[PDB]
Amino acid sequence: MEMEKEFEQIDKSGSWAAIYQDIRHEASDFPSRVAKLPKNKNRNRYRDVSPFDHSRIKLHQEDNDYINASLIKMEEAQRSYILTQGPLPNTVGHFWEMVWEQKSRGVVMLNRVMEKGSLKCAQYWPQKEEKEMIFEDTNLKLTLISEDIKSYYTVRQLELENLTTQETREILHFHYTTWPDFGVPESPASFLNFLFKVRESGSLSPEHGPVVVHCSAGIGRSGTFCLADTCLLLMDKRKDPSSVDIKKVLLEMRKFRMGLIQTADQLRFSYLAVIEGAKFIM
Numbered sequence: 001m002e003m004e005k006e007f008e009q010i011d012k013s014g015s016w017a018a019i020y021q022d023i024r025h026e027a028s029d030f031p032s033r034v035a036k037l038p039k040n041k042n043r044n045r046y047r048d049v050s051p052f053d054h055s056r057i058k059l060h061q062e063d064n065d066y067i068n069a070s071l072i073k074m075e076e077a078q079r080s081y082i083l084t085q086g087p088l089p090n091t092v093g094h095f096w097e098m099v100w101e102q103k104s105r106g107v108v109m110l111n112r113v114m115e116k117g118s119l120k121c122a123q124y125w126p127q128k129e130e131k132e133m134i135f136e137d138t139n140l141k142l143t144l145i146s147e148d149i150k151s152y153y154t155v156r157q158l159e160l161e162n163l164t165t166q167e168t169r170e171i172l173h174f175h176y177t178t179w180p181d182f183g184v185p186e187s188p189a190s191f192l193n194f195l196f197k198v199r200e201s202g203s204l205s206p207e208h209g210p211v212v213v214h215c216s217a218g219i220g221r222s223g224t225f226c227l228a229d230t231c232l233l234l235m236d237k238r239k240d241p242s243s244v245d246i247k248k249v250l251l252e253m254r255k256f257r258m259g260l261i262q263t264a265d266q267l268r269f270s271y272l273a274v275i276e277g278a279k280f281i282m
């Protein structure tokens, strides 16, 4: 079926939970043996969210190459994304090592450091120009260059220096600051505006490594971001945009990381975002 009218048909019939449970039943199951090794317990935020072995990102290290991060490669759309958990106190150096080694231009953050009164990820970037951060375990230096605070999101320019080689690179930090502590946003308008700002920066384009996107677990809000982006790109590429099947795209993405889209409300919000976004594109 088309999307907008399939949407109204699920609303009127109140069957979002049944649609979402079908997706969960059909989703791929692949091994994640490296994630579960005992030496990696303090590298995982949640025991039930792990990268598959076949698609995990490897650190360029011989001691321990593990990080909770996955490469999502969308062949027809010609987009790639790295989805990862919010960094932990003992993985902030690994996080920036990955950004460096994978040649990413941008980092997309969809959570606040504290939500619901609890810490959802480490403070992993510097908050003042004159107070830089040094990650001694991976030999990297990180400096805040500039910050632009808007009503729904903040964009930061960061300088990442490989201290072994003295090479430097400019990284863009796109921080969506207004996702509610509970539920999903009422309108997709600010989330779409944010997506378009990431796109306009070049961070999603083939001349760079894959964008790094995270929330707390790296599957819920993060899944919504890449699902909406890929669906809108396919609607632009194809002769028949009504042929784009958001459930099929989500199942394809779940071949590369488990659990993408965590609730039926997140599924409905993804439909809403693609529907409204397709009208603005034209």
Ligand SMILES: N#Cc1ccc(CNC(=O)N2CCOCC2)cc1
Residues within 6 Å of the ligand: 074, 075, 076, 077, 078, 234, 245, 248, 249, 252
């Ligand atoms: N990029 C991309 C991309 C990702 C997932 C899908 C899922 N759809 C799919 O398998 N089909 C079957 C054959 O053509 C119609 C849609 C398609 C494209």
Ligand SMILES: N#Cc1ccc(CNC(=O)N2CCOCC2)cc1
Residues within 6 Å of the ligand: 145, 146, 147, 148, 155, 156, 157, 170, 172
């Ligand atoms: N290449 C690049 C690039 C650099 C920085 C940004 C973010 N903007 C920023 O730092 N400011 C400073 C305060 O007023 C103006 C905007 C985006 C792209």
